[PDB]
Amino acid sequence: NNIDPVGRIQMRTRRTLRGHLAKIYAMHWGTDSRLLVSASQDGKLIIWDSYTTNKVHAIPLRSSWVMTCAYAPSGNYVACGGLDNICSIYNLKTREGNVRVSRELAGHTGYLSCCRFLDDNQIVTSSGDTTCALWDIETGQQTTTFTGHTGDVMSLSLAPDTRLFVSGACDASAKLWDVREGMCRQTFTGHESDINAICFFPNGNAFATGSDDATCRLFDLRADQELMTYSHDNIICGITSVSFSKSGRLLLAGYDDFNCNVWDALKADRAGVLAGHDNRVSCLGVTDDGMAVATGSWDSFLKIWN
């Protein structure tokens, strides 16, 4: 209403990654804008790239079903999900071996949904029993435990300053959690239905959240409320994943119509319209530089848009 409209922006495909047969659930992009890891369904830890367009590692796993893949900021450790509560941690740089395991993470009752690497030592997992606790490879046990959601959580989101993370369960609400003390600091509500994925602002002042109610909103940490709402009349489906831009100016949200929609910051206008997906999109990844955005659907098509 006051901000100058950016206008209609055209999005084109930069590259298409082919050579995988399993379903692509998670697409975690590294902090170096060079490599990215994706998840499979037959226990194949696959790592892709944008410019070179060549996979670098693939190792069979004990757990066939993989829900997520976490890529370390330094590119040293990697961990996959799983429904059998087996969060096997793997490393790339190994002597006399390609990929090996040293520590085994166990002790969860609910199914693991997503995993995020806070740093090279402490990692956080999202289980299906409302235990989004933090773990360590050295001690093999959890340090702090986060609880307070009436339902199980299925998504996580870290912060650039590496000090706290926001977590939102299926209770149509999101809560912030500190790594030091380990308890909810603020609760945000206003979604009509459950959420699927959450994303954090690069600056750290707010965070966006997409739900199945065909609505989007960004909760402010200082104002303790959302600024604007992204309603939709001709959309009956929901949002499976949400992400920000390099600095948080552009909004990205994948819908169930085998495409994605690019929303503005305050104008709430569909500037970019996506297409070309044969199956339902699962998760998309935005690089730190904000140049290209890779999307992951169920048709084993890792298309990069730029």
Binding site: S245, G248, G290
Partner: peptide, 19 residues
């Protein structure tokens, strides 16, 4: 604030020369 964190990405997202 609001527009200070948005002008940073408004210069590299649309001016990308495929580098």
């Amino acid at each position: 604030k609001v527009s200070k964190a948005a002008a940073d990405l408004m210069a590299y997202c649309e001016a990308h020369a495929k580098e």
